[PDB]
């Protein structure tokens with residue numbers, strides 16, 4: 001069911017890790033800076049996400065997180081179906097790659113306004129989600145609202 | 151404009167601080183554990199919130215955050231109108247008090263499943279936002295904002 005599908009994405013900058021969740025149908029994202037991508041960090045990020053949006057299915061970003069007992073525990077707790085993130089359609093991976101580049105670009109554009117990387121990442125989340133193309137933020141709300149009325 | 155109005159709420163547990171943002175019209179919340187309520191922590195929390203939902207107006211939780219230059223900078227950056235949180239209608243404060251009690255109760259009910267308080271708080275956020283009262287707070291916020299976009 002399209003409304004509930006999210007994709008995990010892990011990218012790197014300034015020797016740190018940026019963990020991203022993308023709502024596939026809308027392009028809407030949430031993101032956090034973590035010291036490194038562990039099962040525990042990924043599990044906590046998914047718990048936060050699922051408390052905030054109706055997360056039905058997650059395409060995990062790699063096999064370590066797919067295997068992780070802590071990630072599996074979080075998915076069980078929050079009612080998330082954990083799936084692999086293998087792009088059976090290969091245009092999927094190019095879209096994520098492009099987004100990581102887009103996000104890094106925005107981070108560079110705001111980097112001066114923020115002392116800490118985590119502030120710059122949240123500025124980038126804001127700009128990404130508000131960007132008129134409707135915005136991603138508008139699309140996710142419309143998609144989920146339409147789904148609730150069924 | 152009702153769709154964009156949020157209220158900040160700071161409550162305490164286990165010698166730590168839980169910062170909550172409530173979407174007034176729906177009862178939907180986001181929350182985080184912080185070591186203490188500083189301007190900088192509050193500013194960052196508001197930036198995160200406004201990147202994720204269309205935050206137009208925030209009723210700040212106290213005068214220190216209302217005054218804070220860092221909070222004012224975040225509100226300017228994110229396009230948020232900062233207002234005081236004085237309950238000109240006094241039933242407002244009782245609703246927040248009740249929610250803090252409700253959240254603490256849920257935290258107690260899950261506390262055993264979580265090693266860290268921050269995990270228990272996000273479990274409580276999840277349970278609060280999914281609770282059917284019939285629609286949930288998560289369903290209501292999406293419906294309110296979708297109606298407003300159109």
Ligand SMILES: O=C(O)Cc1noc2ccccc12
Pocket residue numbers: 040043044045047073074077263264265266269
């Ligand atoms: O128990 C913890 O604090 C580890 C943890 N971090 O995130 C979680 C999500 C679900 C279940 C457990 C966790």
Ligand SMILES: O=C(O)Cc1noc2ccccc12
Pocket residue numbers: 129130131135136137138141200201202203204295299
């Ligand atoms: O994109 C907008 O300007 C309005 C908006 N509508 O819904 C949103 C959700 C998240 C973020 C922003 C929004």
Ligand SMILES: O=C(O)Cc1noc2ccccc12
Pocket residue numbers: 113114115116119190193194195197223224227
């Ligand atoms: O990293 C900083 O510059 C401080 C900061 N923390 O959170 C913010 C939000 C908006 C603007 C600035 C900040």
Ligand SMILES: O=C(O)Cc1noc2ccccc12
Pocket residue numbers: 050051052053054144148279280281286287288289292
């Ligand atoms: O509350 C629900 O069961 C589904 C739901 N619909 O929209 C939401 C937004 C946030 C969290 C949960 C939801």
